[PDB]
From a paper:
[name]-[name]-2 variants could induce immune escape by mutations on the receptor-binding domain ([name]) and N-terminal domain (NTD). 501Y.V2 is associated with multiple S mutations, which could be divided into two main subsets, one is clustered in NTD (L18F, D80A, D215G, 242–244Δ, and R246I), and the other is clustered in [name] (K417N, E484K, and N501Y). Combined with the antibodies that we previously identified from convalescents, a total of 831 anti-Spike antibodies were identified from enriched antigen-specific memory B cell clonotypes, and 86 potent [name]-[name]-2 NAbs were selected to test their neutralization ability against circulating mutants, including 501Y.V2. Among 86 potent NAbs identified by high-throughput single-cell VDJ sequencing of peripheral blood mononuclear cells from vaccinees and convalescents, near half anti-[name] NAbs showed major neutralization reductions against the K417N/E484K/N501Y mutation combination, with E484K being the dominant cause.
To further investigate the diversity of anti-[name] NAbs against 501Y.V2 variants, 18 additional VH3-53/VH3-66 recurrent NAbs previously isolated based on VDJ combinations were tested for 501Y.V2 tolerance.19 Although these commonly found recurrent NAbs share similar structural interactions with [name],20,21 their reactivity to 501Y.V2 is not uniform. The neutralization ability of most VH3-53/VH3-66 recurrent NAbs was abolished by [name].V2; interestingly, there do exist NAbs that are not affected. BD-508, BD-236, BD-629, BD-604, and BD-515 are class 1 NAbs and displayed a similar [name]-binding pose. In the crystal structure of [name] in complex with the Fab of BD-508, Lys417 and Glu484 form hydrogen bonds with Gln100 and Tyr102 in heavy chain complementarity determining region 3 (CDRH3), respectively, whereas Asn501 interacts with Gln27 and Ser28 in light chain complementarity determining region 1 (CDRL1). Thus, K417N, or E484K, or N501Y found in the 501Y.V2 variant would all greatly reduce the interaction between [name] and BD-508. VH3-53/VH3-66 recurrent antibodies respond differently to [name] variants, and K417N compromises the majority of neutralizing activity through reduced polar contacts with complementarity determining regions.
Numbering used by the authors:
A (entry chain A): 2 to 132, 138 to 217
B (entry chain B): 1 to 214
C (entry chain C): 334 to 443, 450 to 527
Write the structure that this text describes.
């Protein structure tokens, strides 16, 4: 009893994309099948629904650009995303709506990113300590697309590390920082290096952070 | 057109507690209310349908109650796996779908005031023409804090961005960063950069600052 | 021999939309302006005809169908619409010649059900009373309500304090057929 989604990716504004959802424990043509999305840090908004008898309905922010549809042959639900806008960036879910009995089979979620940015490796800057406990960190500025991972001293420093979620700037690029607290007494003795890895750009940076 | 209002946006509670979340509807929807759980990075699970029926596979500690406009999801003993976000759905006029805005369950914990550090721009960065100034608020609880940037005592607005961690697996505290982004040309036009933090565990605001070139 | 429009409009009990009532009207005279000039209906749109000429026309048979429905659902009682009521409860043909009359019914109707589950859309003037448990999977349901196994009718929760959109409305659909047979319903 499962829904398997697929077909998300990066596209650029005004582009096109096609999401697919394959069903195991029920018949898609016998059911209300709904498409629901969730933007970064927001709630679940409705997108599209197909009725068992064929009728389709759409969220007002979406009419005339998306198409819900289905092939009976495969229990597969489809969403055709045309004229994409950055607006539409979110995780998309299919779900079977049993109405009174609730939305009971949900997809894993597939991620749809709409942006005109170019993939760019970050510039790593030092967040240098200052003049009992002392904080230092790195600033991972101006990168795209999303996945960036940060470690310290190739892994041998985990206590007091906080790597923050990324923020999306007006430029369409992400920033984040990771910070760490250490004894002030160690400041000049122990070397603190941060290790940044942005895989979409094949970037790997080590940056020493020193008073 | 049928608007859902989840009532505590954030509810902090402890393992073992009887936690009651509420939901609220714009119209009497009888008992056509559903209830959902979503852990971060995962998809939603249906817990309770028809206001009070328990979904199969839902644990026994989950119970629904309500008719009309007011509803309740109740957990009788919170287990660690239940810290998550709970959404309600109406199923009364459903071709336009509406969900509640969420209630997040945090871990209750004693108040902790934050450690505040301000970081000047690197000289590396200034070569590129851009100056970003960082303020850390480290290991505090409750999540609610206010950060105010002052440049030469001029409150800033619209040139700030901030990010917050999830509750720490060991402290149960939060940590926050704020980044004040401006041009090298403007940066060098001003001397005192400052960070004013307000928080429930601080008696008065704490202000960390630096003087450009010192 | 006046037509019993009274017995359908001013009736005490109306039917749920899924099991709508049909009154056939035959061998009588019909003032269609005791109805149009009343200012007591909120919706009264006519499709194959114009109410002014209705007292100047004769029809082989007239059918009056009646039911209750939500205010936001009266919009579906038109030709060419979709939605849960149009699809699974009461369907008007694309080539419809008749009149659709509704009025707000909160004072009398604030039980009524509608069909939520069907595998295919209803044909025009089809009436499905079936209460078979609905099969949403490949497993048979066996009168048993559970997973993939849903009761097909759900209740309008008609509650007086809701906005007009979710309040009960009473509807009469007047269907006007001309056949190659002696007309029996003559407006005059």
């Amino acid at each position: 009893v499962q829904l398997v989604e697929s077909g998300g990716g990066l596209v650029q504004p005004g582009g096109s994309l096609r999401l697919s959802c394959a069903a195991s424990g029920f018949i898609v043509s016998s059911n209300y099948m709904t498409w629901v999305r969730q933007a970064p840090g927001k709630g679940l908004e409705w997108v599209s629904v197909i009725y068992s008898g064929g009728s389709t309905f759409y969220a007002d922010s979406v009419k005339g650009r998306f198409t819900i549809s289905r092939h009976n042959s495969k229990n597969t639900l489809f969403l055709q995303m045309n004229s994409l806008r950055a607006e539409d960036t979110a995780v998309y879910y299919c779900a079977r709506d049993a109405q009174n009995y609730g939305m009971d089979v949900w997809g894993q979620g597939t991620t749809v990113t709409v942006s005109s940015a170019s993939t760019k490796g970050p510039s790593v800057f030092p967040l240098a300590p200052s003049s009992g406990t002392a904080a230092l960190g790195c600033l991972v500025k101006d990168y795209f697309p999303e996945p960036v991972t940060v470690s310290w001293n190739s892994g041998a420093l985990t206590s007091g590390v906080h790597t923050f979620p990324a923020v999306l700037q007006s430029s369409g690029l992400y920033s984040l920082s990771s910070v760490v607290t250490v004894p002030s007494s160690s400041l000049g003795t122990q070397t603190y290096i941060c290790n940044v890895n942005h895989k979409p750009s094949n970037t790997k940076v080590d940056k020493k952070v020193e008073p | 057109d049928i608007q859902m209002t989840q009532s505590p946006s954030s509810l902090s509670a402890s393992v073992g507690d009887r936690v009651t979340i509420t939901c609220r509807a714009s119209q009497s929807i009888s008992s056509y209310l559903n209830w959902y759980q979503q852990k971060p990075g995962k998809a939603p699970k249906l817990l309770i349908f028809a206001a009070s029926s328990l979904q199969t596979g839902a644990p026994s500690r989950f119970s629904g109650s309500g008719s009309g406009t007011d509803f309740t999801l109740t957990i009788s003993s919170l287990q660690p796996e239940d810290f998550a976000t709970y959404y309600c759905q109406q199923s009364y006029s459903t071709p336009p779908y509406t969900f509640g805005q969420g209630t997040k369950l945090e871990i209750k914990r004693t108040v902790a005031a934050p450690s505040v550090f301000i970081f000047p721009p690197s000289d590396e960065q200034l070569k590129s023409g851009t100056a970003s100034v960082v303020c850390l608020l480290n290991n505090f609880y409750p999540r609610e804090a206010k950060v105010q940037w002052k440049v030469d005592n001029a409150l800033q607005s619209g040139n700030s961005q901030e990010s917050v961690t999830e509750q720490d697996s060991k402290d149960s505290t939060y940590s926050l960063s704020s980044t004040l982004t401006l041009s090298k040309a403007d940066y060098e036009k001003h001397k005192v950069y400052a960070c004013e933090v307000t928080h429930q565990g601080l008696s008065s605001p704490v202000t960390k600052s630096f003087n450009r070139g010192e | 021999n006046l037509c019993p429009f009274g017995e359908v409009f001013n009736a005490t009990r109306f039917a749920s939309v899924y099991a709508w009532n049909r009154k056939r009207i035959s061998n009588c005279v019909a003032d269609y302006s005791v109805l149009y000039n009343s200012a007591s209906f909120s919706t009264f749109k006519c499709y194959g005809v114009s109410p002014t000429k209705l007292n100047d026309l004769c029809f082989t048979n007239v059918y009056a169908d009646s039911f209750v429905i939500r205010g936001d659902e009266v919009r579906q009682i038109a030709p060419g619409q979709t939605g849960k009521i149009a699809d699974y409860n009461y369907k008007l043909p694309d080539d419809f010649t008749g009149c659709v009359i509704a009025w707000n019914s909160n004072n009398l109707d604030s039980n009524y059900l509608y069909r939520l589950f069907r595998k295919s859309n209803l044909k025009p003037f089809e009436r499905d009373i079936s209460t078979e448990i609905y099969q949403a999977g490949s497993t048979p349901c066996n009168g048993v309500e559970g997973f993939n196994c849903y009761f097909p009718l759900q209740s309008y929760g008609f509650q007086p304090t809701n906005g007009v959109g979710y309040q009960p409305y009473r509807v009469v659909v007047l269907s006007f057929e001309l056949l190659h047979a002696p007309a029996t319903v003559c407006g005059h």
